[model samples]
Target: KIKSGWERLTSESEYACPAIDKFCEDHCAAKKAVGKCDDFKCNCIKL
Candidate 1:
């Protein structure tokens, strides 16, 4: 699922970029994407 502005949605919530990046990169590779991993900071996009 594509998500954006997560950190702003809820301060109590946390979207660790480091962790997400790992999954993001893995998913991107599984998808055979040619683009960069877009999951960073509270933003993400399907690769």
Candidate 2:
């Protein structure tokens, strides 16, 4: 979660990246899950 850095994680990419190659690590669950550039709100994993 805190491995790929905060900027790369929460970046709102209107069009997400390709599968198996999101580039956020093969273990990161939220890699292709929420890698966007929008205003995301989350208190659990604050940046």
Candidate 3:
């Protein structure tokens, strides 16, 4: 089963970097204030 509220998506280093800082900023703006990234992957919260 899938969980509700605050979804998370993972991708490779190159993709994750831009997705979180840039992409996610435009997309998840209303849902999440900011996104997070790490060596392993990037994490963004969406409501």
Candidate 4:
């Protein structure tokens, strides 16, 4: 089954945010876990 654009976006964000968050937490030092899913991509802030 294929998902609609909105559904896909939501699902991607659901998985991407947590994964990116973990990556940021593990990699980034002395900061916060701030990221977002945009256009099926995960963008994490390194700060």
Model 2 is weakest, by summed lDDT over 10 consecutive residues, at 37-46
Q: Over 4 Å off in model 4, which ranges? A: 1-33
- For lDDT, candidate 2 versus 3, the one ahead is 3
Top model number, lDDT: 3
TM-score: model 1 vs. ground truth? 0.26
Tens digit of per-residue lDDT, candidate 4, span 1-47: 55655444334545544544565345434355555556675555645
Q: In candidate 3, what are the lDDT values of residues 1-47, reduced to their tens digit?
A: 35867566564654545653565465556665556565765456644
* Candidate 2 lDDT by residue in tens digits, 5-26: 5545454443453232445333
Instruction: Give the higher-lDDT candidate: 1 or 4.
Output: 4
**TM-score against native, each model:** 0.26, 0.17, 0.29, 0.26
lDDT of 2: 0.36
Which tens-of-lDDT digit does each residue in 22-46 have in candidate 1?
6446655666652242334333345
Q: Sorted by lDDT, highest first, which candidate order results? A: 3, 4, 1, 2
TM-score for candidate 4: 0.26
RMSD of 3: 9.8
Task: Please list the residue runs of candidate 3 whose C-alpha ends up more than 4 Å from where it truly belongs after superposition.
Answer: 1-20, 45-47
Candidate 1 Cα outliers beyond 4 Å, as residue runs:
1-20, 34-47
Q: Give candidate 3's whole-model lDDT.
A: 0.57
